[PDB]
Paper text:
Therefore, based on primary sequence analysis, [name] is a non-Pfam singleton with an unknown function. Each monomer is made up of 8 α-helices arranged in a spiral pattern around a vertical axis that runs through the centre of the protein. The structure reveals an all α-helical topology similar to those observed for nucleic acid processing proteins.
The 2.17 Å crystal structure of [name] in space group P212121 consists of α-helices and loops with no β-strands. [name] crystallized as a dimer in 3 different crystal forms. The analysis revealed that dimerization occurs via a large area that spans 904 Å2 (12.8%) of the surface area per monomer. Interestingly, the aromatic ring of Tyr88 from one monomer protrudes into a concave cavity formed by Leu52, Pro53, Leu84 and Tyr88 of another monomer, zipping the monomers together. As for the crystal form P212121, the packing arrangement of the dimers clearly deviates from those found in space groups C2221 and P4122. There is a 60.9° orientation difference between the corresponding dimer in P212121 and that in other two space groups (C2221 and P4122).
Residue numbers in the entry:
A (entry chain B), B (entry chain A): 2 to 129
């Protein structure tokens, strides 16, 4: 009772991983965005267990992934892009190409942006 | 046999990818071993599109992933470890831990074995 109870509460909280690993696309969808938030910094221990889960349920995560790419959380999109793009099946890989091209042609005004543009350029040439 | 026609014929054969991307675990299972063969060299262009599909279906591929890790093709297990393990959900990750420990124990006598030991030791420290 309480699907939201399965969302990690902090960056070390792997207490719900075993439960999360049993869900199918339809059951996890209502908290998928919340689980994506634990990829905001892959340096977090919980991010390691969360990544395999969100990738597995990629086909209900795409609208939330786009939301992240359009937003202003540079660190979050850096990890989502770097970590999830190489593992999206073809139709999903296509849904985010626009955003990757847009990121590749951001004006470089700092090192974080340089990271994002360069990553977005590498991944276009590599996976597309 | 219809299903076996969905196996790529060669390293440039992405003609079956759209059909492969629609299948569920139990449909794809009988050819998952043949699909894993396209990770024998990730430099093969079709490998990029096969990887997301075999990871998506990890929970019917584990027996075959064990065979590869226990087998005689060093390059093949190299790509399977390097590419798939970071994206196995927790229970599936645990299933291959013993193989990584075994491989990390190989006496290093050439650079290919060196690659395998370094990779296994790194992944054990990082993901386990």
């Amino acid at each position: 009772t309480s699907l939201r109870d399965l969302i990690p509460k902090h960056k070390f909280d792997n207490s719900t991983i075993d439960q999360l690993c049993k869900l199918i696309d339809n059951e996890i969808e209502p908290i998928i965005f919340d689980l994506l938030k634990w990829l905001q910094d892959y340096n977090w221990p919980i991010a390691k267990d969360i990544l395999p889960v969100v990738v597995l349920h990629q086909s209900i995560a795409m609208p939330h992934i786009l939301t992240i790419l359009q937003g202003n959380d540079i660190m979050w999109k850096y990890w989502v892009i770097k970590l999830m793009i190489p593992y999206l099946i073809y139709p999903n890989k296509q849904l985010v190409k626009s955003e990757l091209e847009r990121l590749s042609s951001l004006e470089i005004i700092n090192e974080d942006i340089r990271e994002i543009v360069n990553l977005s350029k590498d991944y276009l040439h590599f996976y597309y």
